[PDB]
């Protein structure tokens, strides 16, 4: 049960979902909980005096914000999500996120296209670290851009390759992918010539 924090009915839904899941053993995720620190303190106090089901899990997804209560941080286990340390780590994360069955489809060139996409994403995200030289500003090149690029690659490869096992590299729609990534997927965030 996924609930986005921020509204009073959102708090009611969160309370009801937690009360149901601590008995049924289902998972409850609450997003952007950093926007309600007082309700976070109340939630920590509620969680301390509780004996939930063995399979119950409560995920609280937030941004790193000093307003998050300290007692909640001590009560839970913290996982920090941030850009991967390097190109190799970025490519490993990309290859882990993308399902194997998606890459290993009918065209044998899809694997190489996905590898090139992963390398491009890793290079761009690593260039983001050097803010004035790698880019001009800290662009939000993230997972959404990678997913959109993968969807575009899949769409245009299935369009060009009508279920064939192999497609000649000359026939791959390079212009389509390049233009859509430069103008729509990655170039949409770019506001600099």
């Amino acid at each position: 049960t996924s609930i986005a924090i921020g509204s009073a009915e959102g708090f009611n839904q969160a309370d009801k979902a937690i009360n149901t899941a601590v008995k049924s053993g289902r998972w409850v995720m609450l997003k952007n909980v950093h926007l309600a620190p007082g309700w976070l303190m109340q939630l920590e106090k509620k969680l301390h005096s509780l004996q939930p089901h063995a399979c119950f899990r409560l995920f609280l997804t937030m941004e790193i914000n000093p307003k998050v209560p300290v007692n909640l941080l001590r009560a839970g286990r913290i996982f920090v999500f941030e850009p991967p340390p390097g190109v190799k780590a970025n490519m490993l994360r990309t290859f882990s996120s993308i399902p194997v069955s998606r890459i290993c489809k009918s065209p044998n060139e899809r694997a190489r296209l996905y590898f090139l996409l992963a390398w491009f994403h890793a290079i761009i995200q690593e260039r983001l670290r050097y803010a004035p030289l790698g880019w001009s500003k800290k662009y939000e090149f993230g997972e959404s851009d990678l997913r959109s690029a993968c969807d575009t690659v899949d769409t245009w490869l299935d369009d060009t390759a009508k279920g064939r096992q192999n497609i000649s590299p000359d026939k791959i729609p390079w212009s389509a992918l390049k233009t859509l990534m430069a103008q729509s997927i990655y170039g949409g965030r770019v506001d600099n010539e």
Partner: protein, 1622 residues
């Protein structure tokens, strides 16, 4: 006798006038012809006033008087009846046509049956005798109509659920408010009333076409008159239900648009694949079909031609038929350009412009395709374009057309868009189209972000219109919460419409996170709708919105346009950002948008014009001076290009008219060839940009024009008729009019520029410093336009910052989801509805006040081209063409680029309104308007003649003002503040002359005496107006300068300044010292609160304040705390018996609500023919609202004090707005006096210049050492008369007092501690304490007097000290001062360090031994333990000191304590012990976690009831921890300062309090019956009985914060620093 003839005419008209009645479905005879009746009443009222003007009026006065009353009554009745009738009509249609409402809502159905019976009975009575007077003479008719209106309103408000269900029935009703939805549902039978509501439910359908019966819907029409005729007309008789035939109309609209598109495509296939096109055939085809249809057909033909050419070239080595496509496009473009070069009908002209834009885009695309050597139709260089494919073989007409971009495929929605302004399709609108279509194919939203003026909101609209979608634009703000956005989403999903939520980042971050859920579920529903596995035969795709299953239409989409570069905007959560595909729209291609715009408008040199005009705008941006109101962006180029097209059309029409009236020879080609397009563009550029320019930038911009456009000159038109109207209006308004370089020419030019801007922009801003003539400019323009065009001008002036944004725009109730209209919303909706003909008048909504993004960014869609006021409840109000939105501001330092860009600017400088103009206005008003309401007029005329030489250019007043601007004043000096002060003082001089004439009927003032008096008083008033708010040194400087520069006789004293002299009525200077006698105060009146020892400053300030108050002019006293501002004001008001003063104590949390509570208590609202008037309950008395801390109220982040804006509106405009019903309330018999500390003091803010313009400021500084010596020597001489042996010690003692005071005031300042404020208040308390000690004693040696003096010095100057070294300094310096001024005394006897005084061991206040006091306190503590509190206390010396101090304060009237020290030091326990000793009952508020402001109000009511009605002495002990909100501190501040909270007792609580006060007064033996006397007695009792003891910790920043949050804690509470235990 013409008055009698006209009265007889009116009598005959009203005796013959009958209400025009028309039958209503055989139910009753409804009144018809409201406009004629209202116009007749207005005309007769104006005529009666015109007769009141004449003198002969008297012989008929009473009769005419009687007439107006009847007339007024008539108006009043018919100001209600119409509304009533209208309401009933639609309510009837809801309770009769619909059968489900009786089962759903039976109770108010029966209620409406009863009220309908009453209404039909009344209508039958009217039908029996349709005479207007006979109707007016019906008993209780007015009350009956008001009761019917109230009941109808309650029923109408009790119909929300039915309206929601009806919205569910017809989804487009989600975009219609409850009022208009009720109107639509009720008036379903009478279709003619629904025509004004179709614009809110459809994109381009403004009205529908019916037959003569109004039973068959033959088609639809747009706002431009374009009509679409249905192939299958919709029959209303077959489908009586409103929603059913509305749905049929919408479906038939789509079907007929599809069929007409098919026919248009079949027709336009001829023009395609054709080498030469006949212009007549193309024009006939264009006229045959709609604008969107002809553009769509052209796009389809071009796309199919390009596809055929690419299929032909697919071989690679084949020929290139793409050149054929380019040639056909160029031929058609040449035909279109030839067509737009000659006169065309406006609809065909717009069609031709759209076709030119589309074909220029097509030509560019085809040239790009040819240049890229494209031979395959599957090349992405062709696939990335927007391609239109038509399939005539498709059975479903709605699916015959497909629009494809890359892999994205869309179906045309076939929504009728009317004639929409098409956007040049530049490269960024192509990139925008590509990115947004990619987002749509992924079932995501679109997010074009970037600065403002880039195309984000229109590019979204243009893409939606290109796909034939209904795009709804929403101007988001912080009030778009989860529920409002969810309901908007429900409406969009059910309708199948595009939602463009602009300024999306203005929502709260929590609200964005919450709305992410709805966006995600909507996108999931859309994605499951896209899968081919889904079949429409199955259950429709639904989503979970607002706990409801809402069907989702595949045509729906969500777009958000935002500018992330604004600081203070919300950050979208990542889970919300991942739902949208973002695109940076930063640099629009302005060169192409111009070139294409000028090409489509008929300019032959469009390329040269664009290449000259875009760099010109860049040059203006980068070369003119940087101003906050300058905008040279895209919304300013498109404003110039549109104006250029309009000006070219006007010039062509003018040339044709000249040719017609001079011979007969007209040729379109000759005119087009011989036409100065350069001059047209320059004229538009000037008309748009010159008004905003500052004086120095005009030559720069004209030099830029000469550089970029050499040889062309801008000669502005000479609007002779408008200038004559302006001259007449200025003459009747006492305003100076001038032509060119004459006095006032700049102002008249600014007025003409404002008139020019009104015609181009529906949003205006008059930007300029206070007193630059903006208000007079637009008022005179409105009156002149009314007199010239004959259109009545109505202006609604709104102060946007004097009220909250909720009160300005409206409030959505979080519980019942009911919308309450704000001020601007109510005004705009009333104009739009046009119940009383508001659409036939020129409506100007002037936002006079400060502009900040928070309130004005809600007007982006209004001041844009959407012209829509978007509300959170999904309602959209279209701005009528006759409405102008005006912003009269003094600066734009807080407005953003989005606001500045959307509005036309007129810059008024202080040089526009010269000082000669103000002098002329003053002199004309003096010579014309009598001061009494004629000997007074003759006196004014003579005085104006005498003052004429000095009120000239380079005159005495002008030079004096110029010199005074160089001095230093306690407040910022503005010209109009000084000029208003001087004019008020001169009016007072004229009134003084009139009073002298009245006092001497036999011998009135002669010419020479009047001249002498007026000249001397002019010098005196210049001194007191140009230097009143400055120190004595600056007053002396101004006096010396005037003596240098004046020819008026002046006092010949070698060193005494002129400021020390007054002007006697005999026309001679007389020293002020002659009015300052050495008075002898009574012994029992020593240092009393109302006793004032006259001094020079006292008498001068009293005279000045009397001068300013007698004119009812609001005024301000600025000075250090304790200087004597309140004392001087009360002493001056004592000379004005017809003035009742009410004291308000401003704090940092003060809002206009305090003033509203004071008005609700001391004043009353009454209804008059002219509106609502708020006047004091007392008759013949003027209420003086004395605000004591005017500059304390909090200034927001945009530099505005809301209460200061409220007071400025109430002074400048003479009233305010009631937000309960948004009604203008006019103040009567109310004036304003304010007091403040200098703005440089901590916590004080500088008052607005607009506010300071209306309030003269007088600087009341601390009395000097000589003044202090005089005042307190008088007090000490009065006091020491009790003991004769001490009388000879009156002179030294005072000196010692003064000396020590001065020393303390020099040693302890606010730099060390915030509360280190020493004032003559301390000296008054010193005299009071010594007098109280000496009063019971019959004799006393000098040593006892010195001991009392030292004790009082310790209690006043040492109790507040924080550090020990400060207290040691105070002790040592008291000793040294006493020895210095009292030698030869027993030092040890009078200065034994334990200086303790107490009345516990005796009847009198005599010195007490420490050990005896300790034993007595021990015994009293034992009794205290055995009776009240059994908490043993250890007694040490500081405890004895503290209990003595607390007893001292508890024995004083209105004695409040502020004990500051570490928690646990015993402050509360000692306070309770002393209160028990003195017999006071201890009251403490029991604060818990649920303790709110209402609980504190109840506790305050209990305390006030006990201490004011029951005569019970109460010590109210309050701790800083008990304060949970700032309202606690506000009420405590008011109670501490005044002794009564104004809004604490209201409703039945006030009645109960009045009954208890009457009982208490009867117990005391007083005869009080009136509520005012009862409240005054209650306040006196509360003052005498309630002692508030405030305890807090010794915080550093907390004390400084409290010094501003609760000022009375440091002025009315004695501060005792207990601190920590030493």
């Amino acid at each position: 006798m013409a008055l009698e003839e006209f009265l007889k005419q009116i009598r005959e008209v009203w005796n013959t006038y009958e209400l025009d009645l028309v039958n209503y479905q055989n139910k009753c005879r409804l009144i018809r012809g409201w406009d004629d009746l209202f116009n007749k009443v207005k005309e007769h009222i104006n005529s009666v006033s015109a007769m009141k003007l004449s003198p002969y009026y008297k012989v008929f006065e009473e009769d005419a008087l009687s007439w107006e009353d009847k007339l007024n009554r008539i108006m009043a009745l018919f100001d209600v009846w119409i509304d009533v009738q209208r309401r009933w009509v639609y309510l009837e249609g809801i309770f009769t046509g619909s059968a489900d409402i009786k089962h759903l809502l039976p109770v108010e159905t029966q209620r409406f049956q009863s009220i309908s019976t009453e209404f039909l009975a009344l209508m039958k009575k009217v039908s029996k005798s349709p005479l207007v007077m006979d109707v007016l003479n019906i008993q209780g008719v007015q009350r009956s109509l008001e009761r019917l209106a109230d009941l109808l309103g309650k029923i109408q408000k009790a119909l929300g659920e039915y309206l929601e269900r009806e919205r569910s029935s017809f989804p487009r009703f989600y975009f219609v408010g409850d009022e208009d939805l009720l109107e639509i549902i009720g008036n379903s039978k009478n279709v003619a009333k629904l025509q004004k509501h179709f614009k809110k439910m459809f994109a381009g359908v403004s009205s529908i076409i019916l037959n003569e019966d109004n039973s068959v819907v033959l088609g639809i029409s747009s706002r431009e008159g374009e009509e679409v005729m249905f192939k299958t007309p919709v029959s209303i008789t077959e489908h009586p239900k409103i929603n059913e035939w509305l749905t049929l109309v919408e479906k038939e609209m789509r079907v007929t648009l599809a069929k007409l598109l098919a026919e248009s495509v079949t027709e336009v296939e001829i023009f395609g694949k054709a080498t030469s096109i006949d212009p007549n055939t193309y024009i006939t085809w264009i006229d045959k079909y709609q604008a969107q249809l002809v553009v769509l057909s052209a796009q389809i033909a071009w796309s199919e031609n390009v596809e055929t050419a690419l299929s032909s070239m697919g071989g690679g080595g084949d020929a290139a038929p793409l050149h054929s496509v380019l040639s056909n496009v160029e031929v058609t473009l040449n035909v279109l350009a030839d067509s737009v070069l000659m006169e065309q009908p406006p609809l065909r002209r717009r069609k031709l412009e759209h076709l030119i834009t589309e074909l220029v885009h097509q030509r560019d695309v085809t040239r790009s395709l040819i240049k890229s050597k494209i031979d395959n139709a599957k090349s992405f260089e062709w696939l990335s374009q927007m391609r239109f494919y038509f399939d005539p073989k498709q059975t479903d007409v709605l699916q015959q057309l497909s629009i494809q971009m890359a892999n994205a495929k869309f179906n045309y929605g076939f929504e009728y868009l009317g004639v929409q302004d098409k956007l040049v399709q530049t490269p960024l609108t192509d990139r925008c189209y590509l990115t947004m279509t990619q987002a749509l194919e992924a079932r995501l939203g679109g997010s074009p972000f970037g600065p403002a003026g880039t195309g984000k909101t229109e590019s979204v609209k243009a893409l939606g219109h290109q796909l034939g979608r209904f795009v709804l634009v929403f101007n988001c703000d912080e009030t778009f919460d989860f529920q409002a956005m969810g309901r908007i989403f429900v409406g969009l999903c059910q309708v199948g419409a595009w939602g463009c939520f602009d300024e999306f980042n203005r929502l709260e971050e929590r609200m964005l996170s919450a709305v992410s859920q709805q966006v995600q579920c909507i996108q999931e529903a859309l994605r499951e709708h896209s899968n081919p596995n889904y079949d429409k035969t199955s259950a429709p795709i639904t989503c979970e919105l607002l706990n409801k299953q809402v069907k989702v239409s595949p045509d729906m989409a969500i777009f958000i346009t935002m500018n992330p570069g604004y600081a203070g905007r919300s950050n979208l959560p990542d889970n919300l950002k991942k739902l949208f595909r973002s695109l940076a729209m930063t640099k629009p291609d302005r060169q192409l948008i111009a070139q294409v715009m000028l090409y489509s408008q008929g300019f032959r040199t469009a390329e040269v014009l664009a290449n000259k005009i875009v760099p010109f705008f860049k040059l203006c941006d980068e070369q003119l001076s940087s101003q906050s109101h300058y905008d040279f962006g895209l919304r300013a180029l498109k404003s110039v290009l549109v104006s250029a097209g309009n000006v070219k059309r006007e010039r062509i029409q003018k040339i044709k008219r000249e040719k017609e009236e001079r011979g007969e020879a007209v040729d379109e080609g000759e005119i087009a060839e011989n036409l100065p397009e350069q001059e047209i563009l320059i004229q538009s550029v000037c008309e748009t940009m010159v008004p905003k320019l500052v004086a120095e930038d005009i030559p720069l911009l004209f030099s830029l024009l000469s550089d970029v456009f050499p040889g062309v000159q801008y000669h502005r038109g000479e609007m002779t008729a408008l200038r004559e109207e302006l001259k007449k209006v200025c003459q009747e308004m006492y305003l100076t009019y001038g032509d060119g370089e004459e006095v006032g020419g700049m102002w008249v030019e600014k007025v003409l520029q404002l008139y020019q801007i009104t015609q181009i922009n529906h949003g205006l801003m008059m930007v300029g410093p206070s007193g630059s003539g903006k208000s007079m400019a637009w008022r005179v323009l409105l009156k002149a336009l009314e007199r010239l065009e004959g259109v009545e001008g109505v202006a609604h002036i709104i102060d946007p910052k004097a009220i909250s944004k909720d009160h300005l725009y409206g409030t959505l109730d979080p519980n019942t989801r009911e919308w309450t209209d704000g001020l601007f919303t109510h005004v705009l909706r009333k104009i739009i509805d046009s119940v009383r003909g508001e659409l036939q008048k020129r409506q100007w909504i002037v936002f006079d006040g400060d502009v900040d993004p928070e309130w004005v960014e809600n007007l982006n869609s209004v001041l844009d081209d959407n012209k829509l006021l978007t509300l959170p409840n999904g309602e959209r109000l279209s701005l009528p063409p006759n409405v102008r939105i005006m912003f009269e501001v003094q600066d734009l330092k807080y407005a953003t680029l989005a606001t500045v860009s959307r509005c036309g600017m007129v810059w008024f400088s202080e040089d526009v309104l010269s000082t000669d103009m103000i002098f002329n206005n003053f002199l004309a008003r003096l010579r014309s308007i009598p001061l009494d309401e004629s000997p007074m007029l003759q006196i004014q005329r003579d005085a104006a003649t005498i003052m004429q030489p000095y009120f000239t250019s380079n005159g005495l007043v002008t030079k004096a003002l110029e010199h005074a601007f160089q001095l230093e004043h306690i407040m910022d000096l503005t010209r109009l503040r000084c000029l208003g002060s001087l004019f008020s003082m001169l009016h007072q001089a004229c009134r003084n002359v009139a009073q002298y004439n009245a006092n001497h009927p036999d011998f009135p003032m002669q010419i020479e005496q009047l001249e002498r008096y007026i000249q001397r008083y002019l010098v005196y008033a210049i001194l007191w107006s140009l230097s009143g708010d400055s120190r004595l040194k600056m007053r002396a400087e101004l006096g010396e300068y005037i003596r240098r520069i004046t020819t008026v006789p002046l006092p010949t004293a070698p060193n005494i300044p002129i400021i020390d002299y007054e002007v006697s009525i005999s026309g001679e200077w007389s020293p002020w010292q002659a009015k300052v006698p050495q008075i002898e105060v009574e012994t029992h009146k020593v240092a009393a609160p109302d006793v004032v020892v006259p001094t020079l400053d006292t008498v001068r300030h009293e005279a000045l304040l009397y001068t300013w108050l007698a004119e009812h002019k609001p005024l301000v006293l600025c000075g250090p705390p304790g200087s004597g501002k309140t004392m001087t004001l009360f002493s001056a008001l004592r000379a004005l018996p017809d003035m009742e003063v009410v004291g308000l104590n401003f704090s940092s949390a003060t809002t206009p609500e305090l003033l509203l509570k004071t008005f609700d208590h001391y004043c009353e609202y009454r209804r008059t023919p002219n509106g609502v008037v708020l006047a004091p309950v007392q008759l013949g008395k003027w209420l003086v609202l004395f605000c004591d801390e005017i500059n304390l109220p909090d200034m927001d982040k945009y530099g505005t004090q809301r209460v200061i804006s409220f007071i400025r509106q109430m002074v400048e405009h003479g009233g305010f707005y009631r937000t309960s019903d948004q009604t203008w309330v006019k103040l009567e018999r109310i004036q304003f006096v304010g007091a403040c500390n200098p703005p440089t003091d901590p916590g004080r803010k500088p008052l607005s210049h607009r506010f300071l313009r209306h309030v003269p400021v007088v600087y009341v500084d601390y009395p000097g050492p000589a003044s202090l010596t005089q005042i307190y020597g008088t007090f000490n001489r009065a006091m020491l008369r009790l003991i004769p042996s001490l009388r000879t010690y009156a002179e030294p003692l005072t000196a010692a007092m003064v000396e020590f005071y001065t020393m303390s005031q020099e040693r302890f300042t606010q730099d060390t501690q915030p509360h280190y404020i020493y004032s003559p208040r301390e000296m008054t308390r010193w005299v009071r304490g010594i007098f109280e000690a000496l009063r019971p004693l019959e004799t006393l040696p000098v040593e006892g007097l010195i001991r009392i003096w030292a004790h009082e010095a310790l209690r006043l100057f040492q109790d507040r000290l924080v550090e020990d070294e400060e207290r040691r300094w105070t002790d040592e310096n008291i000793d040294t001062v006493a020895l210095k001024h009292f030698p030869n005394i027993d030092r040890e006897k009078a200065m034994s360090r334990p200086i303790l005084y107490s009345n516990w061991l005796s009847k009198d206040y005599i010195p007490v031994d420490q050990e005896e006091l300790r034993d007595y306190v021990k015994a009293r503590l034992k009794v205290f333990y055995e009776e009240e509190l059994d908490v043993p206390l250890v007694l040490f010396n500081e405890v004895l000191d503290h209990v003595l101090r607390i007893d001292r304060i508890f024995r004083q009237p209105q004695g409040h304590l502020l004990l500051i020290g570490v928690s646990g030091a015993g402050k509360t326990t000692l306070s309770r012990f002393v209160a028990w000793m003195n017999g006071l009952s201890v009251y403490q508020i029991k604060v818990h976690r649920k303790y709110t402001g209402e609980d504190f109000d109840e506790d305050l009511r209990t305390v006030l009831r006990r201490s004011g009605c029951k005569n019970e002495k109460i010590a109210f002990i309050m701790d800083e921890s008990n304060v949970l909100d700032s309202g606690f501190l506000e009420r405590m501040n008011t109670l501490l300062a005044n002794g009564e909270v104004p809004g604490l007792f209201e409703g039945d609580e006030y009645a109960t309090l009045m009954t208890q006060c009457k009982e208490g007064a009867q117990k005391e033996g007083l005869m009080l019956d009136s509520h005012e006397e009862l409240y005054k007695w209650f306040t006196s009792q509360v003052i005498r009985n309630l002692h508030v003891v405030f305890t807090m910790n010794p915080s550093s920043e907390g004390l400084k914060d409290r010094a501003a949050t609760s000022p009375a804690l440091f002025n009315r509470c004695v501060l005792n620093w207990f601190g920590d235990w030493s």
